[PDB]
């Protein structure tokens, strides 16, 4: 019935009320994407090939000679929306262009930080899984990419501290959801050693600077 | 041995600092000429923290004064306690800033920097053992951090190796009356965190409310607003200058208030503030100080503490006193509202007892607090970049200079993540299972 | 001939010794300027100052103390105070910067810059010594130099002087009242060194002396000076039989062989029973039985842990004044008839008794009173385990989120030392458990 | 208790393949979690215990603190995966002079120390999955002049992945080890 | 029940010296007969 | 435990009422003594 | 140890409290600027009861002053004892109630209660032990009767175990001072029943004749008239502040006076009241003092106790005298006329004594009395109100401020049962 540091609520018998809330661990309202505006325009050379293997993306033009400076920041902006005929193109399209081609993932790194933190800032437990898989895939499927992300840990990692210890305390009863990985804390952790194993020296300190719970491997 | 060099930048550093130096000169007993006329010896025992002996019994400060307008620090050098500063420390430019932040970073890149670095060098080196620096400035003007990340990017090269405090005047939440204003709020941040990490954020709107509702001064100028900060600056250094039963220097405050290295937020406060007609009818006891310094009214930052959690509290007191009353401040307010004292820290209060009180007053305190309600201070600036950033209409004045606008857009990304890092440790609890 | 050097480290340790050497000089005839006065004599000579003072050719007594501390303007209080010419200017040694409540700074960064000079002064003080019983240290578990520089001092004193009776006095972080946030870090790190390099570590809490000052001494708003005089009264009673003759003269070596049963259990509980104000002291008689009773009272302990949650192991009673042995035996007998005071079955004897003929000396401006007889109690219970399980709860609560750890790792230590310091604390509780359950 | 058991050449107290492996074991979880499943190199369920605090979350083989399992078997072998984090584990033994004695092995300890109720020693894990053989009859003889009688407790702390904690009568080579005790 | 004053303090005063902080010399002891 | 089935019967026992409120043999005196030295409307 | 918080609301409560703190400063040696120029130590021992203490040897009163409005108590602050009050305890707002119960309790009493309650917690948290509160105010006014009874309700919700006194001036019978007098009187008495445990009824009319027939001074004013209600507020609580052969407090003067919780409306008075010409004509002895204590013309209510029966009597006394003569005389005055004391209480009279008389008198005493005859006052007021509520006179000045006519009906209902309960215990 009280507020806090007043003359009231210092008596021998009082009850009180705290703050409104803290705006963490909570889903944020999404915003319209540049992926949405550019897909209805038909500028994308993509097609939903409804394979009998599941859904796949058929590329009318070959992936090797795409303008990655105009497409990778545009596909990464689609990770912050969850409606099906657009979110699959963001999830599968990023994975398809990451494992195809070389010597062009490097110059598009510094213009990829903004669309990768915006999807992480949504704080919903669905696309944070997706952004953690592409973060693991970004550092692996090219050459000399972990060294590029070392000065950019300050804009990717603050969301990873919030959900780092997100796991299941099922002490004996076995879980079955390791086929599709929804465990945030294992995905944040495994991304951190993927961050540290690449980038060479002066990479453990940049992770230890801002997620202090992390233990620096590769001794 | 332990010593501080005062850097004053802008009108704001110069006007606040000039009031600060007259306070310290009264506290140590130095006349406006520069000699000692004190009535005690402990007013002289540790005067090698802010003053240097010059030949002739003339104590001279250790402040270097920096501004890009010649006019401002002629009033400082002609003030009441104004001739104490040595002329070589007074380092002036010829043209400053105005209107556009984009002007501010595409104006005087490196002209005045190296001149100040020479003065900061000689004054620091001609001494014994540097405790650190302190910097007084405001976040505003026709440059913001435009001169800032221009001039100081040359000084931040090695400066975060020792202690460096910063009493910074954060923008107030009232109106937008600088026309093309919400472009200097976005381009302000960059390295707003990782070069001081001991910033005492001081709002002017909260400065007036303590002058209107607490001090009850009918016509508060900018001068007596600068009197309130000068007490706090003296408060966080009084254990280093004057002896005490429980000593606490700057590092002992910094170690005991900063759990994580990205916490440049220390909302200040001075406990025994009373109106002139009500000073006579005042108890001035240890509980009386504590119920005022923890109160939302006596907070020189426009953030109500009951909007978040105190991550850590400092209680540098002055006088012959107690500290156990502060323990009841947690045990009542914490264990009942656990959202006002962070529970994964067991005890959130550092105390200090410095024997020598402020002048006139018998007893005092100096609160600084790392409350997580400071998320809102960098959120009012957050709705004040987004509001006018997207139009870019009167930014044609900016456009003529117009630097890289990734630097426009990366500064708030290094500010909203700071808010998120405060939102985490406001919502994070001991048993990390029940917030998911 | 018998003697001991006193070491005072930290602002806590320096301030304890100032109200402690005030007692020592007044216990003898020693004035603040060192020299005893030609007119007036405090008593017989007996060369009893030798345990704490060294005699020069000019007729000056000099304390065998080093005031080593990184904080410059608590020693300069001594350097300009009343006890100015008592101490050497080179016995009192200061650093340049504080450790700032950091164990790592007092151990690794600043501590190595002064550890060479303090060991040179300890060696030079002990070189003129002949039959040195041991050392006494005074510190707190919460400071930087009181925990970090203390830890480095025992590391070096263990190899320079070997196995020698190295007593320890310390100030615990209280369960509730605590002046620091990093205090559970410093206490858990300095006990990792105390457990292996301190022969006996006396255990003192601030809240309990706060409690006995307001209740027994009947003073409101007590300060650090009053806690300082209570501690120095006990330390004088610890070294009482070293200077004055008694019916049962008990040595520092006889303390360790009769208090601590196993090499980790050297954490006695301190109790000073006849602590009473002057307006209520001379009214009632103070028998030796009722002050032996007041030693076992829960609230008269100087650490916040009552022995009802534990079991006593060995109790060292140090009586001063007009005390005959026979009524001590009656006081010990009537304690043993109570089943509420639990004694372990592997110590049927239980008690070590020391009688001294010199009553405690009152300081001018103090709050105690002149009593004909007095007692100091050195208990040893398993109840101290709950005083450390709370510290582990305080440590684990903030170490798990790595709070304030970069204030330690950057200053020359690794992160694994924190888990290593909690490790010995995780074993110390189980070491106090395994000496508590009854043999069947 | 494990007293009426024959205590043959093999005895397993924890095996991740079963209904309730942590049945006799006591679980204490604090700022961590326990789970049971991951197939990295061996395609089998291996119990995971890990947390941000190594000395606070653990598992203890006797559930009741008053009950102690009595195993006379001198060799103590567990198969534990290296995770490049802080891992410690306990073993408590009964001695011929009737002293409750404990041993500790840790990743974060530089040098070893021995004194009367706890002996702490360092340990270097391998790159991945390995088995470690804690010879209790020799460690109770080198550390103290004492013979081995029976162990009383084992306790496994955080940041490790567990499968097949067992005792053996003597050290076994890899070939003579049976099929259900192999690493693969 | 009690033979002397030491057992009166030692018996069920319901004062945990580990938990009891800043009491008075009246609430130093709170016997069970006092409560109910 | 040796029991009997002739105990499940309800105990069907009421408490006999207390003796009536003892009128004292000196009550008739204290009515007259209290109602003595009393008049009406003297001072006011 | 046991200290009393002073409350005062409205113009009347501040004019009474202006002279109340004049005599308390005189009894306890406090000067106008708040420094103890006293004589004995007994005037400094129990000084925490009314006066707090501030740095400088200054004794600040614990009183808070309540009104809606800053432009008048030049009577206090420009008076002889107005610098003693701290400026923080003065609480005010913008527009006044102006003799209207609706304005001071609902509209303008909605934003000042937050300010007044903030101040009284500051006065109540600086205590070792709070004995209770007490209020002086008007009963037919706008701020004294409208705001004052709302402050009573707020304290009772927050401090239910504490004792609250009410020194209210009830409406004068013959000549009124406010036209809307019973509207404020009825709505405020109705709240006073369940929210107070010791209520004092004061007629300005009975103060006029006490000033004339006993005090015998020709030209009166509110200075010496408020002095009568001043020393009554002092003299009741002097057992807290000064010792005696057997002393009392506010709690003991309430448990020994209030049989049933709705019966706590009392009548005060003074025994020694003589002029300068009667100093040589009367002997200051206990029989002469106790005679004029029980006199109907001496009472501070304009309703005779002869019309009903006293329920409970108490008197506080002073001076080094015999307990025998004061005990046998109050038996004597109780038994000689038994038609005015209830039969089912054998001893209606309580005796309390102090050792320190006031300055200027060698022995004095204060009377407090619970009688059925205070129903005479309420039953006039009950038909004052049905003369005006029936034709809806002066009702738009209440209905248009947010209240309904049901609250008027509950106030009639509560007052009429309170009258009917008084008449019930008149008959034994
Ligand atoms: N009993 C008693 N305890 C004291 C006194 N002074 C300080 N302490 C203890 O010391 C603690 C404060 O930290 P300190 O150990 O003094 O820190 P320090 O000795 O100055 O060491 P640094 O932090 O490195 O400067 C408090 O928690 C007190 O318990 C004293 O005068 N008497
Ligand atoms: N307290 C205080 N604030 C000032 C003063 N001068 C300016 N400010 C604040 O600083 C803001 C603008 O000052 P600024 O332009 O940054 O001064 P500059 O640093 O010299 O450019 C205004 O909103 C003021 O509130 C002063 O003398 N005292
Ligand atoms: N005894 C006494 N009564 C007073 C005094 N001043 C006013 N009154 C009474 O108070 C009533 C007026 O109420 P008021 O104080 O104006 O109420 P308010 O408007 O709410 O403050 C009148 O009926 C007067 O009889 C005084 O000095 N002494
Ligand atoms: Mg210090």
* Rg of chain F, Cα atoms, Å: 27 Å
Outline of chain E: globular
Structural class of chain F: mainly alpha
Number of strands of chain F: 0
Folded structure, characterized:
Chain F: Residues 1-18 are annotated as: Disordered. Chain F: This is Enkurin. The structure is cut from a larger assembly and holds one copy of chain A (219 residues), two copies of chain B, one copy of chain C (440 residues), one copy of chain D (184 residues), one copy of chain E (36 residues) and one copy of chain F (44 residues). With 184 residues, chain D is mostly beta strands. Chain D contains one helix and 13 strands; from the N terminus they run βββββββββββαββ. The longest helix of chain D has 7 residues, at 136-142. Chain E is mostly helical. Chain E is built from two helices and no strands. The longest helix of chain E has 6 residues, at 5-10. Chain E is globular, with a radius of gyration of 10 Å. Chain F has one helix at 27-34. Chain F is rod-shaped and about 80 Å long. The B-C interface holds B 1-2, 45-46, 128-129, 131, 243, 245-247, 249, 251-252, 254-261, 286, 312, 320, 322-324, 327, 331, 343-352, 428, 430, 432 and C 11, 15, 71-74, 76-77, 96-98, 100-102, 144, 176-184, 210, 221, 223-224, 393-394, 397-398, 400-401, 403-404, 406-407. The structure holds guanosine-5'-triphosphate, guanosine-5'-diphosphate (2 copies) and magnesium ion. The site of one guanosine-5'-diphosphate (GDP) has 22 residues of chain G, from helix 1, helix 5 and helix 8.
Descriptive labels:
part of a larger assembly; 7 chains; C: 440 residues; alpha/beta; six-stranded parallel beta sheet; four-stranded mixed beta sheet; 14 helices; globular; E: 36 residues; mainly alpha; 2 helices; 28% helix; 0% strand; binds guanosine-5'-triphosphate; binds guanosine-5'-diphosphate; binds magnesium ion; structural protein; cilia; Fallopian tube; PACRG protein; Tubulin beta-4B chain
